[PDB]
């Protein structure tokens, strides 16, 4: 009965929507286009910070990285502000999650090293976590604007929901590094009108958004019931039909989240 | 099926739940124990105010009313403070909507004249909105204490929703008088943890709570979707098994309002 | 010289304003009517929680205190919702500060015991702290409506600033108990349009507010420079000449609060 | 008095501070080093846009301007992504106000035509507004690195302040184009930590920042007191001496904006 509401919304917004909420115990797993590929956009920055955390001792966050004006090829609300002072790996993590800093993402990719600017190294991480589907091919800003139907720079709601579940709810990171990943997502500044807006205020919400061309708008999140149960909520959308220049519609994602919330209550 | 949910919430919370959302042009009506009598408790204070308004000119609102300390018989956070100065009728209106002032409701009843200190004149008024079910027989605070089974001082979620919908959305009052009600109901102080706690914050909510013995908790409220679509939501509950001292479980009404929000999104 | 802006502010709000900011290491005190008595109103609730915290082990915060609907003689946003279940001392503390709950403060005074329904014990605690001017005589709601000119239930901005400094910034409490009072003040709901509104958001502001008749309106707070210097700011006002029904003007306090920030920076 | 506060802030942050608020009817103007030259930096992009606006018709905003990868020489997070799409003038206007787009600056200058790649055109327009002092001479990013003492590419707080007042507050643009300026300015991303960070949140703030070398940081802004009254605040600063790569200190600009808020409150 919930796959009809989602469908009514797809036509309401001239958009395509994908949803996956992994199953807990006392509740069943919500899915809708759950295995249809959607473009990562900036949502990849959450496991990207998880990857960098994984591969290094905490003392590595204090390492200072330096960059030029030419490294700024995308919206960078923080990296634009320290071109000559540079920033430590730790701030790049802060920026990449809390401000969706495109440049910070691109440096953290580099910290991972390897071919393809670190993208292949990153897709390695997801595989390690059990994710046999996602793939990262470009850096910012290209990874937002692959053509519709192109499998490059894509994930599924099913697969991204489970990478998130392991990172914050599971054991992919040791607790000290996990709390860093969590607190960042919790102090995010970019998802106030998405899954955050579809849930009551006494539900805690930590999230990481993603936005790109072709009307793409995503929001992956972990939410906490007012009694303290956690649920993982992956919502994803595009409007590829209306062209590269199609505005995204955040309301669709907030409205989705409200259908989902009434189910988890 | 949304009715399996309300029976879940009943089991999880050890209660009897009652839900009625009038059908709008764009949605079908919600029903769960819709035409079962629940106790009014303090929810009658909303139709009470619109009664004094309906019979009297706006100038009536300045009739200062005086009272003794023996007239204070229920929770009356406001009446208690003016027991030597008195309160105008329009204060007793503020008093009784926003603080659920028991005593002020008793005065407001007396102001409607008639036998049983105005309860006859009041049920009388309800019937002019087409409501032949509900009745008010007691005063404050006895109406809160009727045994289960007993039909005195009872309404139903169907009955109360439609009355409310006439008074806030409909022409049951002219605009000048109508905005005094909606304003008090909007700046109410007693309902933060009920219907309000279960709709996301981009929804506007105005409510009047009621609470009494045998676990009685209610909230009648008019909500507004983030795009301005008004709905009407009547939620009532009692736990007439757990005893006369059974505690009311607000979470139940809040968990139920989230179910409704799922359907209206 | 900051005495000129204040006196200008007295004139266009038709109010009388008291202001005190104790002198920190590098900066000189700010005073203006700093020793003219002003009514406590509800600001006394914060050192009252201090007094209860002081005389009892932490486990005393679990004592269940039980009250009746007769005990509700004043605005009590939380105490009015737990008349049947009762409330613990730590619940009362939370209400007394974060919601200025009136009934909550009365039971806490009763926990202090002693003559005067506890007003004696509270006034003595203040002496212990160094305060030889303030005095609590009545309970709530009487303490809000002593007539102008009446020393009863009055403190001074001077005296209240030095009490608040010792509780928050000194050793008048031990760390475990002190960090409880701060958090309650840091998480207040009544203070958003006063000293909080007059300080840039990058400053941290914890406060307790007071409001009574004759346009009385105070706010007592500790603030933190965005580099972390702490300052104490006692601001108190009334409009007692306008009469018992004079409205308080919150913007006077925000604006006085902005005058002071300009000087702490 | 305030004059002494700004030289305090100068001593502590190790800069020379420049401050000018035009006098309004109600206030007397603030001046600190007000007619001393500081470097435009990015703040010229405010009058730059209004120049395109003034001279061309609205349709001109839809002229697409194509550019090469060689034309990217400054921090250009928006121009970096459209090297194939090109950008309309309206877009290069957005980029240059809200993201301080270096490479969209130049393009708009080249739209002003004439000699020096439109630097001669630009001052030209400045003089048509009364401003006899400021000159623009280079482009991005040369104009950000002129040595101290050099008069090229410089303005003064008194200078820039009155042009900004003409543009946002005055009649240097017909209201239809007057709104596109202020709108872009209101939704600016590059200046959260400067003047905005020094005025309370019930003050509305619009601004165009500038940054460069020798610790140069500026912020020109139009602020609105909570009652509705508008002021113009020009805040500039450098730290020549401490070196060419001497890091700029946003804190200073935020500090000084809090003293301004002190006087105007």
Numbering used by the authors:
A (entry chain D), B (entry chain A), C (entry chain B), D (entry chain C): 29 to 293
Please share excerpts from the published article on this structure.
At 3, 6, and 15 ms, the DED features near the active site of subunit A are weak. Substantial displacements of the residues flanking the active site are observed. Particularly, the long-side chain residues such as Gln112B and Arg173 (called guardian residues) move outward from the active site before relaxing back to their original positions. Next to these residues at 3 ms, almost 10 Å away from Ser70, there are positive densities that are spatially more spread out than that of water. An SUB molecule can be placed in the electron density. However, refinement of the SUB is difficult. Nevertheless, contrary to expectations based on the size of the SUB, no electron density is present at the earliest time points. This can be explained by the smaller second-order binding coefficient, kncov (1.5 mM−1 s−1 for SUB compared to 3.2 mM−1 s−1 for CEF), which prevents the accumulation of electron density at earlier times.
